[PDB]
Design a protein around this ligand. Structure first.
Ligand SMILES: O=C(NCCCCNC(=O)c1cccc(O)c1O)c1cccc(O)c1O
Ligand SMILES: [Fe+3]
Length: 288
């Protein structure tokens, strides 16, 4: 993925990303943020005031300091009229809105901060530093990143080389798998936890699988992202995972079925200073 590139133009920046080129004024004072990871970055940088609009449909329990902000909808039910009425100087999006790119730019300059599945740490830093630049806050961002890298090293040193993990999502009562270089790739790729299957095709919502596949692989850890919470279904992951095939595996045996927090792993996608640090600790605490 093309990184973001910026050129300082005094009162603004000239900014290139994967989708376009925008002029962006320095210190934008009314930002609509449609990536929840970027919304915790604003919190981290003490930029709470500069946000005028949040996706309240999808506001995680972990961002409930953003609870008084106007809503612009949810992340593929984005409400343009909400956005137009708040009159933003900047609109920040990621992959789930890429399809509405021309339209958002109509209202305000529109910055793309997707994460690269293949180069997660490069892109995360890129996104965070690019955003901090607009506010003169690189110093701060950098200190926050450094603390993230030390935690990744801390966590890496405690990983058991002899154990392998399976990443799965649950939706309806359907299971689907992810491996390296996917949207949860950081468990394998950044934290170094070995995959039980290195050869799972990367897909935005994963690839269809069954409890037989899970027993056959017999992973030592199962990490579970429950898509049912985000999307508003009855179904829960606890339910579909508790069967006689699954229970026979090293993971179920050794109480290492791990229900990762979807508002972090599915929604925020770890594209934020707090989310990511939160996320890394969640894995360490899981596998130590
Ligand atoms: O393009 C995407 N979805 C388009 C159709 C939406 C079908 N899904 C849902 O209705 C839904 C609603 C809210 C949040 C989600 O992630 C969703 O998939 C998409 C892109 C990146 C990551 C995702 O996950 C996605 O979905
Ligand atoms: Fe989705």
């Amino acid at each position: 993925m093309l990184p973001i590139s910026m050129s300082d133009e005094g009162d603004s920046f000239l900014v290139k990303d994967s989708l376009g080129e925008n002029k962006i004024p320095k210190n934008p004072s009314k930002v609509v943020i449609l990536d929840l990871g970027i919304l915790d970055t604003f919190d981290a940088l003490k930029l709470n005031d500069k946000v005028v609009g949040v996706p309240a449909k999808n506001l995680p329990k972990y961002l409930q300091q953003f609870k008084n902000k106007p809503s612009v909808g949810g992340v593929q039910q984005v409400d343009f009229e909400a956005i137009n009425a708040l009159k933003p100087d900047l609109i920040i999006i990621s992959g789930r809105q890429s399809k509405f790119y021309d339209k958002l730019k109509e209202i305000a300059p529109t910055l793309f901060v997707g994460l690269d599945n293949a180069n997660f740490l490069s892109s995360f830093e890129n996104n965070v530093l690019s955003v901090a630049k607009l506010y003169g806050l690189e110093k701060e961002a950098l200190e926050k990143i450094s603390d993230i890298k030390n935690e990744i090293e801390k966590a890496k040193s405690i990983v058991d080389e002899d154990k392998k993990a399976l990443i799965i999502l649950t939706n309806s009562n359907k299971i689907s798998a992810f491996g390296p270089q996917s949207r949860f790739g950081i468990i394998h790729d950044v934290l170094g936890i070995n995959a039980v299957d290195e050869n799972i095709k990367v897909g935005t919502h994963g690839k269809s699988i069954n409890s037989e596949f899970i027993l056959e692989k017999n992973p030592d850890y199962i990490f579970v992202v429950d898509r049912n919470v985000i999307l508003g279904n009855k179904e829960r992951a606890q339910g579909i995972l508790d069967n006689a095939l699954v229970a026979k595996t090293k993971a179920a045996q050794n109480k290492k079925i791990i229900y990762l927090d979807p508002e972090y792993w599915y929604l925020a996608s770890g594209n934020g200073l707090e989310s990511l640090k939160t996320m890394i600790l969640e894995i360490k605490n899981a596998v130590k």
